[PDB]
Amino acid sequence: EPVKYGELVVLGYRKSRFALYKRPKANGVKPSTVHVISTPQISCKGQHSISYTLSRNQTVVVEYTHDKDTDMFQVGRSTESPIDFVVTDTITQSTISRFACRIVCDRNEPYTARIFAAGFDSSKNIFLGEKAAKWKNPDGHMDGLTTNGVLVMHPRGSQPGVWREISVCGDVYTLRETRSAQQRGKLVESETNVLQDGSLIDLCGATLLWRTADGLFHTPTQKHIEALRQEINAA
Description:
The chain is mostly beta strands.
């Protein structure tokens, strides 16, 4: 009983193309207890945690727990243990993040893949410092954007679609004024962070092509070569 979620492919113009398979024992996490605390002078939890540091005092700490029905896959430029696919730039300095983003996959059918901005570090942490876009929504919960952000788009199946920012909790947002301003975009309550076949993900410095399991199983990505170049003409 082997199961492949799908595949990642680095668009040209540390490997080429990373496939994703349902790991034996669930990797996934999902958030729980929240702690809020002020301080004259970053902090977190010896577990999976995300830290939102609002003032020079108050800091929210969302401590993530084991999720039974999901697998996590981390992408970024770090080569430490928690990164599952190392992505280098697609050329000076270095734009991509060490822990760019997570791909969380449902372990039961139809094995949906969803993307989240930021990956946990070699310490189980995401840190969101003052100098980075954050907020609480009416839902009650905290959320933020990564400094550069993860941008996702999906084309019409004809193709070139619209680019969007992914928060650190899913939630789709319209682009910032300019790529990475502290001023975040606007919510899109009606779009999700689901990766449908042939979605594009810009990690800021590299682009990746998501491919659904059934996706590849019907069309080879070779036929989609021209469109991807016509569509990468969105930038």
